[PDB]
Amino acid sequence: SQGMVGQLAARRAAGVVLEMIREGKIAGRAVLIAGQPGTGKTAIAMGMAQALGPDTPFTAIAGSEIFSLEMSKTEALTQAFRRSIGVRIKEETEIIEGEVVEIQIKLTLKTTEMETIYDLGTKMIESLTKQAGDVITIDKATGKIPDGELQKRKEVVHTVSLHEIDVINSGFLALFSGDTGEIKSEVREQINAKVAEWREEGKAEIIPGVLFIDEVHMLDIESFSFLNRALESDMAPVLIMATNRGITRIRGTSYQSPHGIPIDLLDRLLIVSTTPYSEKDTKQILRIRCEEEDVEMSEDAYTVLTRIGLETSLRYAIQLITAASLVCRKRKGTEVQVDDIKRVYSLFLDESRSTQYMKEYQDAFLFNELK
Amino acid sequence: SQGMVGQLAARRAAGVVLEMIREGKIAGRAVLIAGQPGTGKTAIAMGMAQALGPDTPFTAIAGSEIFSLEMSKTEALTQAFRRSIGVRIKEETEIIEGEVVEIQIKLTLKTTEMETIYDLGTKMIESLTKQAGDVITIDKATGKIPDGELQKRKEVVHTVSLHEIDVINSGFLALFSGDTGEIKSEVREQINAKVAEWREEGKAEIIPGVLFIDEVHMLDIESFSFLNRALESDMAPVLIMATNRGITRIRGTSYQSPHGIPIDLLDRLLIVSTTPYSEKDTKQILRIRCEEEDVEMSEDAYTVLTRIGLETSLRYAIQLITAASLVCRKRKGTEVQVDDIKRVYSLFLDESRSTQYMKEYQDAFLFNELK
Ligand SMILES: [Mg+2]
Ligand SMILES: [Mg+2]
Ligand SMILES: [Mg+2]
Ligand SMILES: [Mg+2]
Ligand SMILES: [Mg+2]
Ligand SMILES: [Mg+2]
Numbered sequence: 001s002q003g004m005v006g007q008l009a010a011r012r013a014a015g016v017v018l019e020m021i022r023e024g025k026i027a028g029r030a031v032l033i034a035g036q037p038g039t040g041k042t043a044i045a046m047g048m049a050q051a052l053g054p055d056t057p058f059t060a061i062a063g064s065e066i067f068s069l070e071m072s073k074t075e076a077l078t079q080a081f082r083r084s085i086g087v088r089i090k091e092e093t094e095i096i097e098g099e100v101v102e103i104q105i106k107l108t109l110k111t112t113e114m115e116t117i118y119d120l121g122t123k124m125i126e127s128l129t130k131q132a133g134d135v136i137t138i139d140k141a142t143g144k145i146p147d148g149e150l151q152k153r154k155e156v157v158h159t160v161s162l163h164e165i166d167v168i169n170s171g172f173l174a175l176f177s178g179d180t181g182e183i184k185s186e187v188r189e190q191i192n193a194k195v196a197e198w199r200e201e202g203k204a205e206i207i208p209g210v211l212f213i214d215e216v217h218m219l220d221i222e223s224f225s226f227l228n229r230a231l232e233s234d235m236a237p238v239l240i241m242a243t244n245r246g247i248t249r250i251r252g253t254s255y256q257s258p259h260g261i262p263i264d265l266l267d268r269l270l271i272v273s274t275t276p277y278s279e280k281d282t283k284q285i286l287r288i289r290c291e292e293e294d295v296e297m298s299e300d301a302y303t304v305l306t307r308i309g310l311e312t313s314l315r316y317a318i319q320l321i322t323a324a325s326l327v328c329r330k331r332k333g334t335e336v337q338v339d340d341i342k343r344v345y346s347l348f349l350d351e352s353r354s355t356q357y358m359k360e361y362q363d364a365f366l367f368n369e370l371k
Numbered sequence: 372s373q374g375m376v377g378q379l380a381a382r383r384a385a386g387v388v389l390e391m392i393r394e395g396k397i398a399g400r401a402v403l404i405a406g407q408p409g410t411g412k413t414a415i416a417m418g419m420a421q422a423l424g425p426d427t428p429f430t431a432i433a434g435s436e437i438f439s440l441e442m443s444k445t446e447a448l449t450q451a452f453r454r455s456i457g458v459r460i461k462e463e464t465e466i467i468e469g470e471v472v473e474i475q476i477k478l479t480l481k482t483t484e485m486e487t488i489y490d491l492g493t494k495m496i497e498s499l500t501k502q503a504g505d506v507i508t509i510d511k512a513t514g515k516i517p518d519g520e521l522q523k524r525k526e527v528v529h530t531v532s533l534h535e536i537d538v539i540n541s542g543f544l545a546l547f548s549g550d551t552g553e554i555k556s557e558v559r560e561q562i563n564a565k566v567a568e569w570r571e572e573g574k575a576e577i578i579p580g581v582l583f584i585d586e587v588h589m590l591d592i593e594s595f596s597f598l599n600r601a602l603e604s605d606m607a608p609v610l611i612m613a614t615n616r617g618i619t620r621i622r623g624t625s626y627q628s629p630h631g632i633p634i635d636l637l638d639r640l641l642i643v644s645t646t647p648y649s650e651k652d653t654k655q656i657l658r659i660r661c662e663e664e665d666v667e668m669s670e671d672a673y674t675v676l677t678r679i680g681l682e683t684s685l686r687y688a689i690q691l692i693t694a695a696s697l698v699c700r701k702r703k704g705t706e707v708q709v710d711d712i713k714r715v716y717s718l719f720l721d722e723s724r725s726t727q728y729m730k731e732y733q734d735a736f737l738f739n740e741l742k
Pocket of ligand 5: 591622623
């Protein structure tokens with residue numbers, strides 16, 4: 001584990017894809033992550049974005065989320081793609097770094113090569129109040145920590161997605177306003193042009209990110225045509241789809257097809273697969289979520305919760321970590337124990353027990369009926 | 372029973388959820404109450420709102436109620452969410468409290484520290500007509516019941532839902548007017564802005580309440596996308612859904628799914644379940660509804676009506692309380708008896724007997740046919 005747990009084979013395949021992307025040998029190609037749910041597909045796609053760069057746009061959606069009352073399928077996909085396409089701007093900031101020589105209430109700084117007196121404002125004096133070398137950024141303040149020049153320059157790369165720029169140009173309770181969440185079509189075409197001229201001027205760079213679409217089988221034929229068209233664009237992001245369906249109907253038609261994907265799009269897919277998490281992987285993941293939530297848990301508790309993860313889902317086992325720690329705090333305990341796990345397991349149902357919620361009452365009802 | 376009866380396990384689970392809400396560990400999470408109908412699900416959700424505060428907005432809808440001739444699905448949900456989001460305003464009222472020293476027809480009040488003469492209007496004199504210490508609110512009147520100052524200040528917190536404000540800004544027979552029941556989209560965005568500036572000024576506070584959606588399986592995929600988006604908002608209420616369906620189709624698609632809910636939304640659900648009411652719980656509830664309706668009922672009558680509640684539904688047994696008391700009043704009786712229960716049970720059908728209404732006539736018809 002160097003960022004995530006398990007899924008060694010899938011990660012290995014993902015690595016080969018990353019080398020295709022860097023070598024440019026993935027033009028007009030997308031990825032499909034087959035496998036059952038809860039096998040770390042999102043982690044795979046997310047880690048691929050990071051592998052391309054520290055600030056690579058990553059967007060994760062679900063197939064069902066393009067059918068909404070707030071947007072059209074076209075608008076939903078457009079936003080999904082514009083969140084995954086980054087614009088990289090270089091900010092050039094001036095930074096005065098030097099050794100403090102004197103303060104007068106004028107600031108005299110020096111490097112090993114020069115010395116200068118800088119006028120001091122009221123905000124600077126106070127800021128300064130809160131003979132050793134430091135840093136000062138212009139139109140800003142101090143950062144107490146030099147040779148060469150006193151005023152040097154530091155670069156600050158900024159990465160912003162096309163969608164982020166859409167919002168800046170075009171929010172509180174906006175969801176509950178009743179009006180759609182569309183972006184004006186004439187605003188995007190203004191931003192598409194502003195970003196086009198900046199790129200021609202060399203002031204901006206386009207960084208195609210990673211768009212992850214889970215439950216891709218929920219898309220209909222119209223939406224797949226959109227995706228297929230996007231893979232032919234030169235600025236498109238790395239498309240990654242996922243589904244646990246084998247063969248199924250193509251929504252919008254009466255035709256079966258592998259994963260419910262039309263052939264024109266299947267033809268350009270690199271298919272990978274994830275397997276279910278082993279007993280070791282499951283406990284490893286559980287341990288990592290406990291540290292993140294600052295939850296101390298007994299070893300007998302890890303064993304039980306791990307078993308629950310294998311018998312139900314890793315998503316469900318993680319829910320119980322938050323619940324068990326509260327049950328632990330109520331009894332003034334210091335670490336989650338097996339009893340805490342048993343209680344929350346009885347209080348909160350997993351998807352399988354929830355779909356058969358009476359079977360537990362029928363058993364009890366019959367068990368008492370025999371008395 | 373400290374507010375409601377039975378459902379100890381479900382209430383226990385609900386309590387653990389309340390601690391998550393208060394600790395903030397429920398971001399992007401909703402609740403699903405599985406179980407059969409008539410098991411106090413609404414009471415659970417309602418009690419959770421009260422547990423958050425005395426004036427926490429609570430809204431209860433049914434899945435089928437978003438499909439109407441008066442609103443669109445978007446409008447129906449928007450109102451449902453805006454009824455569940457509260458705006459808390461602090462009114463600062465001046466209250467003169469002091470000991471009456473003299474009346475002149477001028478009112479002289481005093482505390483243990485000061486004394487003052489207040490001019491008296493005609494309304495005040497009359498109001499006063501209807502040497503001991505009392506209270507007076509300015510621009511109002513008297514409340515006959517002190518040290519410190521004479522004019523003190525009392526705070527009156529006011530809680531109003533976003534929807535209540537929508538109506539104030541935007542009624543008799545409005546339902547039968549033929550025109551839709553929409554709120555102008557430009558009016559909400561004006562109220563969203565007025566509430567936004569008040570909050571920035573510290574004059575208003577947003578109180579996310581509790582939205583309860585029963586029969587959630589009636590929602591279609593478009594509506595579930597809306598809910599999933601709302602759980603990502605920071606001002607959203609605590610969403611609570613319910614259904615007695617196990618696995619069923621996702622309306623708008625041809626795919627089965629647990630409770631007819633898409634996975635993107637299932638993934639973020641804490642599932643609880645309610646069991647059927649026991650014989651003891653059922654009689655307890657019946658006793659409480661009698662006191663509320665001011666109905667005296669014999670113990671042999673409670674036993675019979677309780678049995679009816681177990682064999683049909685608690686909703687139906689409660690209907691018979693109103694009917695039986697009228698049958699009781701007709702015969703000039705003082706308390707409902709078994710006979711009163713037997714009569715109304717024969718006069719008013721439960722859902723099961725109503726769906727087989729001829730079987731009672733066929734039995735009688737055949738019974739006479741044999742004579
Ligand atoms: Mg594995
Ligand atoms: Mg369709
Ligand atoms: Mg599960
Ligand atoms: Mg019970
Ligand atoms: Mg429909
Ligand atoms: Mg009934």
